[PDB]
Amino acid sequence: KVQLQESGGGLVQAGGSLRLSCAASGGTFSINTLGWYRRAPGKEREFVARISSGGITRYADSVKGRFTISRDNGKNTVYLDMNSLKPEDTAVYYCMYRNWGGGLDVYWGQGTQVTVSSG
Ligand SMILES: [Cl-]
Ligand SMILES: [Cl-]
Ligand SMILES: [Cl-]
Ligand code: NA
């Protein structure tokens, strides 16, 4: 019963910065965990980041020190601010909505491409 909408992403120069966002509706946003996974060309889908209802963050080692995840319960939106980007970050990024309220246990976004080019 939750719908997700991803925004942002696209082409960006190595070393540069890029924001992804994901907006949800239909659930109880304030109590749920939001995050991102990604699938890079060589690889299978992997955890990138998540943020609890209470603002507690977690990052995969691959992006720790470079990515910041945040949320605005006012707009039902989660943000992924990506910095120091490199070709290893080229991938399809999927929004994640881990549910503690009514509905399915988890919902996934359709995926947003991020492509890192030379600097
Ligand atoms: Cl929601
Ligand atoms: Cl997770
Ligand atoms: Cl962490
Ligand atoms: Na809200």
Author numbering: 1 to 119
List sentences from the manuscript:
Each sdAb recognized nucleoprotein (NP), a critical viral structural protein enveloping the RNA genome as part of the viral ribonucleocapsid and also a vital component of the viral assembly and replication machineries in concert with VP35, polymerase L, and VP30 (25). Here, using mutagenesis and X-ray crystallography, we determine the region of NP recognized by the sdAb and, in so doing, discover a novel tertiary structure of MARV NP. The last 64 residues of NP visible in the crystal structures primarily consist of three alpha helices associating to form an upper V-like shelf of the two C-terminal most helices (arbitrarily named 1 and 2 counting back from Leu695), with the third descending between them to re-appear after a turn as beta sheet positioned under the C-terminus. Electrostatic surface rendering reveals an asymmetric basin-like depression between helices 1 and 2 with helix 3 forming the basin floor with a hydrophobic core of Leu676, Val691, and Met683 at the closed end, while Leu663, Leu695, and Tyr667 reside at the upper more open end.
To date, we have also been unable to generate crystals of mbp-NP600 or mbp-NP632, suggesting that our semi-synthetic sdAb had a chaperone effect on the ability of the C-terminal domain to crystallize for a protein refractory to crystallization by itself. X-ray diffraction data collection and statistics for the bound and unbound crystal structures for sdAb A–C are shown in Table 1. The electrostatic surface potentials of the undocked sdAb flipped 180° from binding NP give an epitope’s eye view of each paratope clearly showing the prominence of the hydrophobic CDR residues that engage the basin. Both sdAb A and C appear to exhibit the classical convex paratope, with relatively large contiguous regions of hydrophobicity, while sdAb B appears less pronounced.
